[model samples]
Target: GDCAKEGEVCSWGKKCCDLDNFYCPMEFIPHCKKYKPYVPVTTSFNCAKEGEVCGWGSKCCHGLDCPLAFIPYCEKYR
Candidate 1:
């Protein structure tokens, strides 16, 4: 994953749209751009145990309990 490989230094609000896709949350909107859904890192982990919280433009699915990824970092496109 880009975030993990890049030391989680991804742009703020920038979501890992998918384990295979990356995009800027602040710049693009779903159904308007090349939007791809993200998969959770821990599909069966407890949210409370991980201090997890899903922000805007995010969804908790695919048996995941944590955010698609962490936040409070830089913001970039591509």
Candidate 2:
């Protein structure tokens, strides 16, 4: 799939949550990363930081370890 990246999945908005991830923050990968799965307005940033909002984008990571959802290996934790 052209959508899936190395560790991240290329998912449509709100669809993958049924058996998927729910942070509402990793909503879309930055345009340079991909665009079909998310609107162009979304930004691409790392979710590993704390309380650090990047650009005018949505807040990232609800919990400190919450970003593990972004990694494919963390599926067991999810």
Candidate 3:
């Protein structure tokens, strides 16, 4: 078969598509990856409104709260 696309399996024997810079061996399996240009990474977060899903640590936007129950979601703060 041809070279794998981004997010697909890759190996030393099987290469990634052109410009797909690297093949990563993650915790479980390896996959193709690429170096995205000049996009500054940030730790900033977008606010989640009521009814939005929760993130790790049960984070939610101001005026919204996270209960962290099964299938966690943002709840109305008051």
TM-score for each predicted model, relative to the true structure: 0.17, 0.17, 0.34
lDDT of 1 by residue, 1-78 (tens): 333221132354544434344344443332223344687686654323233345654444434454334562222212
Which lDDT tens digits does candidate 3 get at residues 1-78? 478777888777677775436656545777676653686878566677678777555467777787746777788775
Error of 3 at 20 (Å): 33
Q: Quantify all predictions' global Cα lDDT against the true fold.
A: 0.39, 0.37, 0.69
Scored by TM-score, the top model is: 3
Shift of residue 61 alpha carbon in model 1, Å: 22
Model 2 lDDT tens row, 1-78: 233333344345423222242222354452223223644676665553554434444344544322323332211123
Off by over 4 Å in 1: 1-24, 27-33, 38-42, 53-78
User: Which model, 1 or 2, shows the larger lDDT?
Assistant: 1
Clashes of 3: 0
Winner of 2 and 3 under lDDT: 3
Worst 10 residues of 2 by lDDT: 68-77
Best by lDDT: 3
